[PDB]
Design an enzyme around this catalytic site. Structure first.
Site, PDB file in Angstrom:
ATOM      1  N   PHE A 121       4.900   1.261   8.427  1.00  0.00           N
ATOM      2  CA  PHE A 121       4.851   2.242   7.359  1.00  0.00           C
ATOM      3  C   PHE A 121       5.966   3.265   7.524  1.00  0.00           C
ATOM      4  O   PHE A 121       6.450   3.520   8.632  1.00  0.00           O
ATOM      5  CB  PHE A 121       3.462   2.917   7.226  1.00  0.00           C
ATOM      6  CG  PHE A 121       3.015   3.699   8.446  1.00  0.00           C
ATOM      7  CD1 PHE A 121       2.578   3.045   9.609  1.00  0.00           C
ATOM      8  CD2 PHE A 121       3.035   5.098   8.430  1.00  0.00           C
ATOM      9  CE1 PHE A 121       2.163   3.748  10.722  1.00  0.00           C
ATOM     10  CE2 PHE A 121       2.633   5.822   9.550  1.00  0.00           C
ATOM     11  CZ  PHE A 121       2.182   5.148  10.694  1.00  0.00           C
ATOM     12  N   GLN A 130       3.546   1.521   2.995  1.00  0.00           N
ATOM     13  CA  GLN A 130       3.237   0.502   3.986  1.00  0.00           C
ATOM     14  C   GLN A 130       3.599  -0.886   3.465  1.00  0.00           C
ATOM     15  O   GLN A 130       3.323  -1.228   2.309  1.00  0.00           O
ATOM     16  CB  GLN A 130       1.742   0.544   4.328  1.00  0.00           C
ATOM     17  CG  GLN A 130       1.302  -0.446   5.411  1.00  0.00           C
ATOM     18  CD  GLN A 130      -0.160  -0.266   5.769  1.00  0.00           C
ATOM     19  OE1 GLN A 130      -0.722   0.804   5.541  1.00  0.00           O
ATOM     20  NE2 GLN A 130      -0.788  -1.315   6.314  1.00  0.00           N
ATOM     21  N   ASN A 138      -1.367  -1.069  12.285  1.00  0.00           N
ATOM     22  CA  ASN A 138      -2.153  -1.876  13.213  1.00  0.00           C
ATOM     23  C   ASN A 138      -3.608  -1.857  12.786  1.00  0.00           C
ATOM     24  O   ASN A 138      -4.009  -1.129  11.875  1.00  0.00           O
ATOM     25  CB  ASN A 138      -1.949  -1.416  14.675  1.00  0.00           C
ATOM     26  CG  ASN A 138      -2.517  -0.034  14.952  1.00  0.00           C
ATOM     27  OD1 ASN A 138      -3.671   0.249  14.623  1.00  0.00           O
ATOM     28  ND2 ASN A 138      -1.710   0.846  15.566  1.00  0.00           N
ATOM     29  N   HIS A 171      -0.427   4.922  16.635  1.00  0.00           N
ATOM     30  CA  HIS A 171       0.581   4.059  16.022  1.00  0.00           C
ATOM     31  C   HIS A 171       1.901   4.314  16.720  1.00  0.00           C
ATOM     32  O   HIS A 171       2.263   5.475  16.952  1.00  0.00           O
ATOM     33  CB  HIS A 171       0.711   4.358  14.524  1.00  0.00           C
ATOM     34  CG  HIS A 171      -0.514   3.981  13.766  1.00  0.00           C
ATOM     35  ND1 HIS A 171      -0.624   2.798  13.079  1.00  0.00           N
ATOM     36  CD2 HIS A 171      -1.720   4.588  13.656  1.00  0.00           C
ATOM     37  CE1 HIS A 171      -1.843   2.676  12.585  1.00  0.00           C
ATOM     38  NE2 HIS A 171      -2.528   3.758  12.920  1.00  0.00           N
ATOM     39  N   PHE A 223       1.493  10.518   1.654  1.00  0.00           N
ATOM     40  CA  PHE A 223       1.209   9.990   2.987  1.00  0.00           C
ATOM     41  C   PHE A 223       2.263   8.995   3.452  1.00  0.00           C
ATOM     42  O   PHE A 223       3.028   9.302   4.376  1.00  0.00           O
ATOM     43  CB  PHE A 223      -0.204   9.398   3.060  1.00  0.00           C
ATOM     44  CG  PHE A 223      -1.292  10.424   2.905  1.00  0.00           C
ATOM     45  CD1 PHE A 223      -1.728  11.156   4.009  1.00  0.00           C
ATOM     46  CD2 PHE A 223      -1.856  10.676   1.665  1.00  0.00           C
ATOM     47  CE1 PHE A 223      -2.706  12.103   3.883  1.00  0.00           C
ATOM     48  CE2 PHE A 223      -2.855  11.638   1.522  1.00  0.00           C
ATOM     49  CZ  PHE A 223      -3.278  12.356   2.637  1.00  0.00           C
ATOM     50  N   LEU A 269      -1.965  10.387  13.443  1.00  0.00           N
ATOM     51  CA  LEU A 269      -1.672   9.035  13.901  1.00  0.00           C
ATOM     52  C   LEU A 269      -0.999   9.005  15.271  1.00  0.00           C
ATOM     53  O   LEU A 269      -0.813   7.911  15.834  1.00  0.00           O
ATOM     54  CB  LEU A 269      -0.792   8.338  12.863  1.00  0.00           C
ATOM     55  CG  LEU A 269      -1.420   8.247  11.463  1.00  0.00           C
ATOM     56  CD1 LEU A 269      -0.479   7.605  10.460  1.00  0.00           C
ATOM     57  CD2 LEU A 269      -2.755   7.513  11.497  1.00  0.00           C
ATOM     58  N   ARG A 306       0.860  -1.176   0.000  1.00  0.00           N
ATOM     59  CA  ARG A 306       0.000   0.000   0.000  1.00  0.00           C
ATOM     60  C   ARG A 306       0.897   1.226   0.000  1.00  0.00           C
ATOM     61  O   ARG A 306       1.622   1.477   0.967  1.00  0.00           O
ATOM     62  CB  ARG A 306      -0.918  -0.004   1.212  1.00  0.00           C
ATOM     63  CG  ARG A 306      -1.824   1.210   1.302  1.00  0.00           C
ATOM     64  CD  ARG A 306      -2.647   1.276   2.558  1.00  0.00           C
ATOM     65  NE  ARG A 306      -3.691   0.274   2.536  1.00  0.00           N
ATOM     66  CZ  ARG A 306      -4.455  -0.020   3.570  1.00  0.00           C
ATOM     67  NH1 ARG A 306      -4.263   0.542   4.750  1.00  0.00           N
ATOM     68  NH2 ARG A 306      -5.459  -0.879   3.408  1.00  0.00           N
TER      69      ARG A 306
HETATM   70  C1  LIG Z   1     -11.026   8.192   3.905  1.00  0.00           C
HETATM   71  C2  LIG Z   1      -9.981   7.672   2.955  1.00  0.00           C
HETATM   72  N1  LIG Z   1      -8.789   7.262   3.698  1.00  0.00           N
HETATM   73  C3  LIG Z   1      -7.697   8.062   4.021  1.00  0.00           C
HETATM   74  C4  LIG Z   1      -7.579   9.471   3.621  1.00  0.00           C
HETATM   75  C5  LIG Z   1      -7.627  10.452   4.605  1.00  0.00           C
HETATM   76  C6  LIG Z   1      -7.513  11.770   4.268  1.00  0.00           C
HETATM   77  C7  LIG Z   1      -7.355  12.087   2.944  1.00  0.00           C
HETATM   78  N2  LIG Z   1      -7.303  11.189   1.968  1.00  0.00           N
HETATM   79  C8  LIG Z   1      -7.404   9.887   2.276  1.00  0.00           C
HETATM   80  C9  LIG Z   1      -7.351   8.914   1.114  1.00  0.00           C
HETATM   81  C10 LIG Z   1      -6.162   9.192   0.222  1.00  0.00           C
HETATM   82  O1  LIG Z   1      -8.526   9.125   0.330  1.00  0.00           O
HETATM   83  C11 LIG Z   1      -8.751   8.097  -0.626  1.00  0.00           C
HETATM   84  C12 LIG Z   1      -6.808   7.322   4.792  1.00  0.00           C
HETATM   85  C13 LIG Z   1      -7.392   6.025   4.969  1.00  0.00           C
HETATM   86  C14 LIG Z   1      -6.985   4.867   5.627  1.00  0.00           C
HETATM   87  C15 LIG Z   1      -7.796   3.736   5.590  1.00  0.00           C
HETATM   88  C16 LIG Z   1      -9.009   3.765   4.880  1.00  0.00           C
HETATM   89  C17 LIG Z   1      -9.439   4.898   4.222  1.00  0.00           C
HETATM   90  C18 LIG Z   1      -8.619   6.019   4.274  1.00  0.00           C
HETATM   91  C19 LIG Z   1      -7.382   2.479   6.257  1.00  0.00           C
HETATM   92  C20 LIG Z   1      -7.907   1.256   5.854  1.00  0.00           C
HETATM   93  C21 LIG Z   1      -7.515   0.091   6.459  1.00  0.00           C
HETATM   94  C22 LIG Z   1      -6.583   0.130   7.477  1.00  0.00           C
HETATM   95  C23 LIG Z   1      -6.039   1.329   7.914  1.00  0.00           C
HETATM   96  C24 LIG Z   1      -6.431   2.488   7.275  1.00  0.00           C
HETATM   97  C25 LIG Z   1      -4.997   1.354   9.000  1.00  0.00           C
HETATM   98  C26 LIG Z   1      -3.810   0.471   8.594  1.00  0.00           C
HETATM   99  N3  LIG Z   1      -3.989  -0.882   9.086  1.00  0.00           N
HETATM  100  C27 LIG Z   1      -3.969  -1.930   8.261  1.00  0.00           C
HETATM  101  O2  LIG Z   1      -3.675  -1.845   7.072  1.00  0.00           O
HETATM  102  C28 LIG Z   1      -4.373  -3.268   8.880  1.00  0.00           C
HETATM  103  C29 LIG Z   1      -3.227  -4.300   8.808  1.00  0.00           C
HETATM  104  C30 LIG Z   1      -1.999  -3.734   9.504  1.00  0.00           C
HETATM  105  C31 LIG Z   1      -3.627  -5.625   9.447  1.00  0.00           C
HETATM  106  N4  LIG Z   1      -5.649  -3.685   8.286  1.00  0.00           N
HETATM  107  C32 LIG Z   1      -5.633  -4.396   7.009  1.00  0.00           C
HETATM  108  C33 LIG Z   1      -6.793  -3.331   8.910  1.00  0.00           C
HETATM  109  C34 LIG Z   1      -8.088  -3.743   8.285  1.00  0.00           C
HETATM  110  O3  LIG Z   1      -6.767  -2.671   9.944  1.00  0.00           O
HETATM  111  C35 LIG Z   1      -2.501   1.058   9.095  1.00  0.00           C
HETATM  112  O4  LIG Z   1      -1.987   0.682  10.139  1.00  0.00           O
HETATM  113  N5  LIG Z   1      -1.893   2.034   8.333  1.00  0.00           N
HETATM  114  C36 LIG Z   1      -0.646   2.702   8.730  1.00  0.00           C
HETATM  115  C37 LIG Z   1      -0.874   4.196   8.792  1.00  0.00           C
HETATM  116  C38 LIG Z   1      -1.516   4.677   7.500  1.00  0.00           C
HETATM  117  C39 LIG Z   1      -2.769   3.864   7.146  1.00  0.00           C
HETATM  118  N6  LIG Z   1      -2.471   2.432   7.110  1.00  0.00           N
HETATM  119  C40 LIG Z   1      -3.253   4.263   5.778  1.00  0.00           C
HETATM  120  O5  LIG Z   1      -3.242   3.548   4.820  1.00  0.00           O
HETATM  121  O6  LIG Z   1      -3.673   5.527   5.764  1.00  0.00           O
HETATM  122  C41 LIG Z   1      -3.939   6.095   4.448  1.00  0.00           C
HETATM  123  C42 LIG Z   1      -4.215   7.582   4.622  1.00  0.00           C
HETATM  124  C43 LIG Z   1      -3.077   8.214   5.433  1.00  0.00           C
HETATM  125  C44 LIG Z   1      -4.265   8.250   3.247  1.00  0.00           C
HETATM  126  C45 LIG Z   1      -5.524   7.814   5.395  1.00  0.00           C
HETATM  127 CL   LIG Z   2      -5.328   5.298   9.380  1.00  0.00          CL
END
Ligand SMILES: CCn1c(-c2cccnc2[C@H](C)OC)c2c3cc(ccc31)-c1cccc(c1)C[C@H](NC(=O)[C@H](C(C)C)N(C)C(C)=O)C(=O)N1CCC[C@H](N1)C(=O)OCC(C)(C)C2
Ligand SMILES: [Cl-]
Ligand SMILES: CCn1c(-c2cccnc2[C@H](C)OC)c2c3cc(ccc31)-c1cccc(c1)C[C@H](NC(=O)[C@H](C(C)C)N(C)C(C)=O)C(=O)N1CCC[C@H](N1)C(=O)OCC(C)(C)C2
Ligand SMILES: Nc1nc2c(ncn2[C@@H]2O[C@H](COP(=O)(O)OP(=O)(O)NP(=O)(O)O)[C@@H](O)[C@H]2O)c(=O)[nH]1
Ligand SMILES: Nc1nc2c(ncn2[C@@H]2O[C@H](COP(=O)(O)OP(=O)(O)NP(=O)(O)O)[C@@H](O)[C@H]2O)c(=O)[nH]1
Ligand SMILES: [Cl-]
Ligand SMILES: [Mg+2]
Ligand SMILES: [Mg+2]
EC number: 5.2.1.8
Lengths: 170, 165, 170, 166
Positions: free
Chosen positions: D114, D64, D103, D127, D61, D123, D56
């Site tokens: 990440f 990951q 997480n 985190h 941002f 965060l 990802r």
């Molecule tokens: C509303 C749209 N939207 C945005 C966002 C916010 C503001 C502006 N624009 C946007 C996007 C571009 O608009 C399309 C975000 C964002 C993040 C998520 C879903 C939607 C999101 C999202 C989805 C699933 C898991 C997580 C985040 C947390 C994730 N955990 C897992 O992946 C675990 C795994 C470790 C087991 N799983 C799989 C489960 C299910 O928990 C995790 O720890 N991180 C490490 C830290 C960054 C973070 N991912 C991440 O991806 O942030 C993306 C981010 C920063 C852009 C924020």
């Molecule tokens: Cl997040």
């Protein structure tokens, strides 16, 4: 908080609708042509200090499928009406888009911006004055753009956002 | 004489999917049938072998035949870059119809499409010149790789092609 | 003619929002989980004899990023509120999604459908009567679905369009 | 550093070398979390990051990665078991190069992590931050370009090799 804007990019085949959209969204340009069927994009941007979510519908230049094309116009809030400065027929086509938008929206006041694209090319056939005069006659902004050099690309889309804002706040 | 038959062996990322054969209506559309026949055998030194079905839209058609630019924009006939619309005798009546793609009047090259449904709004604009004989089930499989905008989920190609006896 | 509807799929993580959407758009199902950030799809359908374009926004189950999620709800015209029949917490989460939609849209009457997904599984913890009672208290329909078998998938989305059309008649 | 270990990733794009990223792990302040990442980078427990993917990548941002068990962004395991608790929130997501644990809610650290490409202060307190890019931030910037708004990458970005530096 943010605000979402539904932009629709229209114009004749090959004038650069997609290249403009890809420059706005992805900040790159290629010479290779990928003819459009239909593509939609979403991008968060700050315009005049306000956070905006741009929903951009990149339409095909083809002129059939009036039912679908009409729906694009019903849903769209503002229209980027693109011709190419080295394609006289594409400029002559522009009034068709204004007529169709006014017909579908049943209004003479619809947010739109006239865009003369490919302004980097030394093969111009449409004078800037002709396009300025046409836009002035519609009461809409006009800008020249180049998806290749990026000249005017942000300004064209941001101007269209400003036209929508004005219409909604009136 | 008996209308010619040609075959395409269709592949998915290089793996065989199946064979589609076509009857070419040389009795009604001879110049257009002959172009497709010759492009299928490769006998002029160029043609369909190796090329992609670049645009597949479920509910409508599978389009291919750009062997010159390999990106949906190209193609050429055995008569030159383009040739005129021969006639509009035949119509886009249903699944399996084989018809020429074009960019407007009198711009036939090599690109073609196989209908997966009736597409009557194309009648009088695209020259129909053949139909699927065997392998509609393979065309149905090809259709499942398409999408709204025509982009395919895996690469669909004409791995081999030729003329049947 | 045609209409267009903005449908938004919401609900807790893992309940099957994406699997439901992918069944509607791509007619297949896989057991593999692909956690969503955000995805959008379009499909043309006929519902009650009336052709329409469905714009489907497939949202992530996560609850943060309230500015973006508020925008999803402002632009959305109807909401699929999905829980899984073997996840009692996801059913308990439904009232939160609903209160958020009502506050963002400034209304007690927003088009929505309660969807109880994963009905193919033998591990039910939420019974049909519980869900029907909740949907009745909201004045909205309840549809049981299985993205795996495709049971109820079309019905869930088409029912939501029917709810939007009913709302627009008021 | 006189106290904190350094580990490296050799990043590949569809198997082609892109470059090396090295990290300082803040064992001085976040010892349990730093030690997990260190051991997963050397592979000394018999499993770890080598071969796994940055699944990802969202420009502006973060990048990951770290799922070496399910190989699809859903899995992960630590050297302590499938999950371990949030150790502390002493450090914050202050800018590009910060290395922090992914997480699925409180106390669910495994192996996914990440690398921030911007400040991600929302965060903080959710985190656990435990390291930073030392060398190779230009390589992280190059990885960021293969991402997209929904995180899907246009080419497969992998940890072709990894280990600990003296
Ligand atoms: C509303 C749209 N939207 C945005 C966002 C916010 C503001 C502006 N624009 C946007 C996007 C571009 O608009 C399309 C975000 C964002 C993040 C998520 C879903 C939607 C999101 C999202 C989805 C699933 C898991 C997580 C985040 C947390 C994730 N955990 C897992 O992946 C675990 C795994 C470790 C087991 N799983 C799989 C489960 C299910 O928990 C995790 O720890 N991180 C490490 C830290 C960054 C973070 N991912 C991440 O991806 O942030 C993306 C981010 C920063 C852009 C924020
Ligand atoms: Cl997040
Ligand atoms: C409005 C959306 N929209 C639809 C449509 C209509 C109603 C409902 N839903 C939709 C779609 C699903 O909503 C996204 C269509 C459609 C078609 C086009 C563009 C947008 C479209 C479109 C775009 C470029 C070329 C053509 C069509 C004609 C094309 N020519 C070239 O490709 C040449 C090439 C041969 C040199 N090039 C590249 C140039 C530029 O001319 C050609 O001959 N064919 C062979 C015959 C089917 C046809 N393609 C085609 O793809 O029709 C798709 C179709 C049937 C769905 C109609
Ligand atoms: N020099 C130059 N070329 C441009 C410019 N904009 C587009 N082009 C070129 O013009 C061709 C057509 O561009 P494209 O964006 O695909 O046009 P379109 O209007 O989207 N076509 P369609 O109707 O098929 O969707 C491409 O080869 C592209 O590189 C520009 O500003 N300058
Ligand atoms: N048996 C069964 N499994 C289902 C069903 N719907 C979804 N699943 C499974 O449940 C898991 C999660 O599904 P998914 O659609 O990704 O859930 P989501 O609600 O989109 N999750 P997210 O909030 O992360 O976007 C996947 O493994 C999927 O195959 C269903 O009806 N039956
Ligand atoms: Cl067409
Ligand atoms: Mg285009
Ligand atoms: Mg999902």
């Amino acid at each position: 908080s943010m605000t979402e804007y539904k932009l629709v990019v229209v114009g004749a085949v090959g004038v650069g609708k997609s290249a403009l959209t890809i420059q706005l969204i992805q900040n790159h340009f290629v010479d290779e042509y990928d003819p459009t069927i239909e593509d939609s994009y979403r991008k968060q941007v700050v315009i005049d200090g306000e956070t905006c979510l741009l929903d951009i519908l990149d339409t095909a230049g083809q002129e059939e499928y009036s039912a679908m094309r009409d729906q694009y116009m019903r849903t769209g809030e503002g229209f980027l009406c693109v011709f190419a400065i080295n394609n006289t027929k594409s400029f002559e086509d522009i009034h068709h888009y204004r007529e169709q938008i006014k017909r579908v929206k049943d209004s003479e006041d619809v947010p739109m911006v006239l865009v003369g694209n490919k302004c980097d090319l030394p093969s111009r056939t449409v004078d800037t004055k002709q396009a300025q005069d046409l836009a002035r006659s519609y009461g809409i902004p006009f800008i020249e753009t180049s998806a290749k050099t990026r000249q005017g690309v942000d300004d064209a889309f941001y101007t269209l956002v400003r036209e929508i804002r004005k219409h909604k706040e009136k | 004489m008996v209308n010619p038959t040609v075959f395409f062996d269709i592949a998915v990322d290089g793996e065989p999917l199946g064979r589609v054969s076509f009857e070419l209506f040389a009795d009604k559309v001879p110049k257009t049938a002959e172009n497709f026949r010759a492009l299928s055998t490769g006998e002029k030194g160029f043609g369909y072998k190796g090329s992609c079905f670049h645009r597949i839209i479920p509910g409508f058609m599978c389009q291919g035949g750009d062997f010159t630019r390999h990106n949906g924009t190209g193609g050429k006939s055995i008569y030159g870059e383009k040739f005129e619309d021969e006639n509009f005798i035949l119509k886009h009546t249903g699944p399996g119809i084989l018809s020429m793609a074009n960019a407007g009047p009198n711009t036939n090259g090599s690109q073609f499409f196989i209908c997966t449904a009736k597409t009557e709004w194309l009648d009088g604009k695209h020259v129909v010149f053949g139909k699927v004989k065997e392998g509609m089930n393979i065309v149905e499989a090809m259709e499942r790789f398409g999408s709204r905008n025509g982009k395919t989920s895996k690469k669909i190609t004409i791995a081999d092609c030729g003329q049947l006896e």
